[PDB]
């Protein structure tokens, strides 16, 4: 390993730093929340009523075990473009809070459904906000909504004061002060109804016809979790280290009992890094704690090569009546595992070192190793 | 009656959800700023045993949420009401509280307003007061509902110098009201008295409406200790009943060892802060 | 009654001299003055490893990283010679001598006083009460003990290494040269030493700065006592100032707010979705998360580049500074030093040397004249 | 200042560079060290005395000529002929004197702060040095300042490089003219 | 930023951002050491005054 850090077949007499140890997880455990009822997902996109645009049907949900994997022949799905969420990577997600809106438009119109757009229906009928998250899901509806004489169903509105903010209705049967007449319900000249059609016709080509939209809305963020995919959980290990998938949460490290005090409204810890140090158990509510596992650097003692060789190695900082005393196959990254480790074994204030022998006498020393500690070539 | 006070230094909240110990995170949000004025409000209908109309319950309007804080003796204070021209013409909210029950919801009603005065309601002979609703008198195009636990759950020391100070806080951005509250019984007299204190989340969902307006509910049948001057402009008049309004600002705030939070310093009142 | 003034600051008190044809100034007295200076010598060593640092402990991460090239080969040959410097450092400073000398059993110097400065045996770690004072009066932040709640949040591949030469043989070296010093004069730091009558050494260098030995020979016991009163006070003021020992504590400082901010830009999107590893891999699929990598990838290497780039700056100054106190060491200490306001102000005598955290500590000895009058001179 | 050289006076621009971290915060620090250090700089070389000494009245050094070098009490500026000639050469550019075309033009955050020791007291520490230096020798600088003949401190720096003063004594006439030629 | 909508307009702001930034690092990196070579001279003036 020496010999390859730096290239060249013939290492002089030092102290070199080669790579890093750490110990490997031994097994995976999942906990997710136990949930068995299934939330309907077919009448949300199975429905002949969609609402229109400037008021448009809201289906909220809740606690269930939601499969995103049969809806897809529910529906041609013209438009499957979803936001930062993967649409792919949907099925094994756990989500706060989950939102589906129904409505259809003119299909010329799909596109503006988008964060910073405006135009006639993104201005005073409905709103997204820019930093939005979930997917949108629209197709044509031609077949059903088409009136041969006219689809007197579906209307927008045309005149507002001003724009909406995102996610907000504004049903209202106003008359719209346009000019400098205060109309008062005459709704003749110079103030128009506020409100127009959809005239729907087999005649007219693609983009005329009515294109039907739903649009599901997100809620990944650090909160309880209410809505989770399909997993199924399994059993608690401690003081191992483990690599743990709670609710949504992967990492890796030793997990102990802590004595933290978690409020109710408070399900995870932070410490400054942006990474989680406490986790509260989604099934049995337990204050845990999470600890990296054990890692340092290692280096290599060698004297001349064309000397000897025989070399000894430095963990730094690491007390070795942990793994480098016990040390197993998958536990250590250095795949050379080959050492006696049970004798030639030395501590030092600068990390223990292993492969020299202590003698009470005392030279100049050539191989510094630090702590007034020092390693030389010497004769029997 | 009407009057002007100093908000001292209160109305500080837990902004996330996360644990923390002995860190000076700082937060950009929502806040009341520290020494302002705080505009005491107050209703007055008793007067003997005859009906001495009020007209109480003045508009208030809603702004970038408001800061609660009465102390009322059991419920006297029961409900609020949110919305834009109380009318058939765009939708409003319906707040109240009940015993063990809270019904808040969204609809369109045209007028609810019945305060159905009594024409004994001077409590000190008799407070008889029971089933005096009077509300969702009617519903045009409404179909949303909400029942769930109420929002207070009082407690008395047995008299009343252990006033409760029930200080809450209403947002509505994006939705999700945010109804942080803490009970702080250790009241004594004085208004707003030194100290700190924290708030709490408990109740998160989204509707969607404008809100340019707030309102109270009072217990108009069963109402005591109303005086009534002129008191406008910066002057004093019992009310115990104040409104605060809040701004987005720019908070530091010091963690506590255990996890609360202890002190709090604002970066837009003075250069040394 | 307290405000803020701001006013126009003076230089000094307004002196004026009485310069003229015949006339001469000559004092009459002298007082001997203990100064003290402080040194930085070398800072703290560390190292920082790119893996787990950039990614922590995830394949693709690492595996996008390798194409980079020779990004972190780079990063770590300049953080070893930052620490081969910094451990050089401490030993030009106080490795001058060959051998190390004993104190002699009996401490009868003439009427000199050293307790202050020799080492104290009742002590464990057989530090003067100076050394001991420096070392309480500086607070160290980190030194590498195994230690296993700031620092123990540094699992991120940032270790500090621990000096090759212990804070108590360093106290050996000084002991050593001060014996030396003390028992020899300046003949041992050249040859081999000689040994020589305190009060003889202290006539010699007296008459290195022009004035004859009788001066010493008739007022040796007011020097032993002015020397006996300097020493003790010099004590008083180091333990009663607010903060004397600042360099150090700078020193100490900015290397720990470095790595609190090296650790904090981890906390940081980079015009990214989210700035955690495991998130942006099981939320996203590999197409647009390699894109997301990278840029956070990129912010990470601009983030660390700029450590190293401070700290080799940094490593320059304080290689300065220990050239600095290894050269007034050889001077001061080891000899006579005739250059003006060198070896503390006033006309030089000689020199103790003590050990501080990070540094060095020099306690000048001088001598200043005293009340004069005037002459007519031809 | 990065908030207006980086994004002009744009609340998006500013909201978008929040993102980067504490980036700027290590742009501030460093560059108000660098500013302390310059400040320092000055104090070490010229603050070297105690108190501020006076030139004598009148003006007679066994007839060597200081009116180059020593303050000239006509000038305004009670600055010597040399220092105003040094003064002259040298054409600075920018000083901080409230500025408020290329300088003008830098009004990107980009400023330019004026030093602390203004350039009329380190001519005051000047003239305090060579005042302590012609009328009391070297021993200014060890303690209080003695007076001694110019002509005898000749002798003294006469003797201090192997010349005896004898010489100094019968040649005093043309070592002032020449002294005086050289300065001159 | 007027001809642009917010979406691009975003990538195109972090482009400019990140060339002004890498522009101005540069700009105290020189400054650093032209600080240390200026006090180096000074310490050598105050020496040899
Ligand atoms: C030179 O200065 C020293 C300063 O200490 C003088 O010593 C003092 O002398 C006075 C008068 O004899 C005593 O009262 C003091 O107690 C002495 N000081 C100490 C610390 O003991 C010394 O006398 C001076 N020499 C001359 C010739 O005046
Ligand atoms: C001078 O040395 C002597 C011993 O050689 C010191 O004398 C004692 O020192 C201890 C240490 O603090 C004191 O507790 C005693 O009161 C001292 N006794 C006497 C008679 O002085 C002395 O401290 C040294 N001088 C100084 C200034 O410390
Ligand atoms: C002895 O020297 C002192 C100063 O060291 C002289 O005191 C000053 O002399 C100047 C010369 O004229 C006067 O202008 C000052 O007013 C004097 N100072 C004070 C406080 O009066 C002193 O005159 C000298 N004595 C002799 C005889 O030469
Ligand atoms: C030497 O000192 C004398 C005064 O003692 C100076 O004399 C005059 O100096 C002014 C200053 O510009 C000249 O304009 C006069 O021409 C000088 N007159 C004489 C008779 O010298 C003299 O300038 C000084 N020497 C030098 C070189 O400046
Ligand atoms: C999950 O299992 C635990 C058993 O410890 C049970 O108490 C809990 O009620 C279960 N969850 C639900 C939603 O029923
Ligand atoms: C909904 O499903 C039913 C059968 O389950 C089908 O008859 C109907 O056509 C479907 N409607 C839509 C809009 O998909
Ligand atoms: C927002 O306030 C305006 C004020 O005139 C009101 O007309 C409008 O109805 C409000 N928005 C909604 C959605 O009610
Ligand atoms: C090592 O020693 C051998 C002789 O045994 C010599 O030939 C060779 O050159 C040496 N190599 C080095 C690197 O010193
Ligand atoms: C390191 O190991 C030694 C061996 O017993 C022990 O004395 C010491 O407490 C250990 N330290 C830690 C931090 O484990
Ligand atoms: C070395 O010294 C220790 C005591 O410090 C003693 O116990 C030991 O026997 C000696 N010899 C060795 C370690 O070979
Ligand atoms: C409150 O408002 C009044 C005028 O309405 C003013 O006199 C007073 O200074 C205000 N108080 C604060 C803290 O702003
Ligand atoms: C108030 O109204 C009642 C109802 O008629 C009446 O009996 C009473 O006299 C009125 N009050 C007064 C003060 O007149
Ligand atoms: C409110 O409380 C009263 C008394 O407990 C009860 O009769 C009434 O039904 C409650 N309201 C609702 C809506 O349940
Ligand atoms: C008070 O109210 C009661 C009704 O509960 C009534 O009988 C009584 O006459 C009233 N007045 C007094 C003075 O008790
Ligand atoms: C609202 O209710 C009224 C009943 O007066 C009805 O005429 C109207 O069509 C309803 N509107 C909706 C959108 O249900
Ligand atoms: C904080 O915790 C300590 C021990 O963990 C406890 O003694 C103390 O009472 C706590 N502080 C509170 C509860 O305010
Ligand atoms: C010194 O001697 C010169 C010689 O003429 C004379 O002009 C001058 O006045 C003398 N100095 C004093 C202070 O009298």
Sequence with gaps: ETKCTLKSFTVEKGIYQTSNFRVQPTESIVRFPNITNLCPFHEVFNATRFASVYAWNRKRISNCVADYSVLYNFAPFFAFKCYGVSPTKLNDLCFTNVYADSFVIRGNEVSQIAPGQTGNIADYNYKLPDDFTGCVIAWNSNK?????????????????????KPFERDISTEIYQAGNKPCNGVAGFNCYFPLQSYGFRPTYGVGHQPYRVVVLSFELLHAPATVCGPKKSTNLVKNKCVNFNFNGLTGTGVLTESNKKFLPFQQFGRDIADTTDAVRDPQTLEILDITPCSFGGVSVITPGTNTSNQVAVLYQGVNCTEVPVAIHADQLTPTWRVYSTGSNVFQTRAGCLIGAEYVNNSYECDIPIGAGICASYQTQ | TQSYTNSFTRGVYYPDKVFRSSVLHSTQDLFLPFFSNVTWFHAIHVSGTNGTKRFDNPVLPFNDGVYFASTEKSNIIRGWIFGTTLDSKTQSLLIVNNATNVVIKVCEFQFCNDPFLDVYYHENNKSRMESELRVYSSANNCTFEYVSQPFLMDLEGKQGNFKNLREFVFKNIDGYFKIYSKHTPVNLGRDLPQGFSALEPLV???????????????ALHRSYLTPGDSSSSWTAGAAAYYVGYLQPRTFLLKYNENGTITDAVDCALDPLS | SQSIIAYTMSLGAENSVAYSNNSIAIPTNFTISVTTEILPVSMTKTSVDCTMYICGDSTECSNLLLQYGSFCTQLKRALTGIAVEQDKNTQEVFAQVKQIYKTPPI??????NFSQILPDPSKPSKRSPIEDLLFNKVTLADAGFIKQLICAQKFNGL????????????????????????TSGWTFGAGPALQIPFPMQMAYRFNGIGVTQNVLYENQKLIANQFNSAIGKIQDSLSSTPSALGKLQDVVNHNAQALNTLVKQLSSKFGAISSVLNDILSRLDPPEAEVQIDRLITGRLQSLQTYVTQ????????????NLAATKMSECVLGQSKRVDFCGKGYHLMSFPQSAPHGVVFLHVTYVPAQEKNFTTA
């Design chain 1, 144 to 164: 059903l909504d088409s009136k041969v004489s006219g689809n007197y169903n579906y209307l927008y509105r045309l005149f507002r004061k001003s724009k909406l």
């Design chain 2, 204 to 218: 998160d969902l989204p509707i969607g409406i404008n809100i340019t307006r707030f309102q109270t509910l009072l």
């Design chain 3, 107 to 112: 401490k009868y110097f003439g009427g000199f």
């Design chain 3, 159 to 182: 270790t500090v290494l621990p000096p090759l030469l212990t804070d108590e043989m360093i106290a050996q070296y000084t002991s050593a040269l001060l014996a030396g010093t003390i």
């Design chain 3, 311 to 322: 700290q080799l700056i940094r490593a320059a100054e304080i290689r300065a500074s220990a």
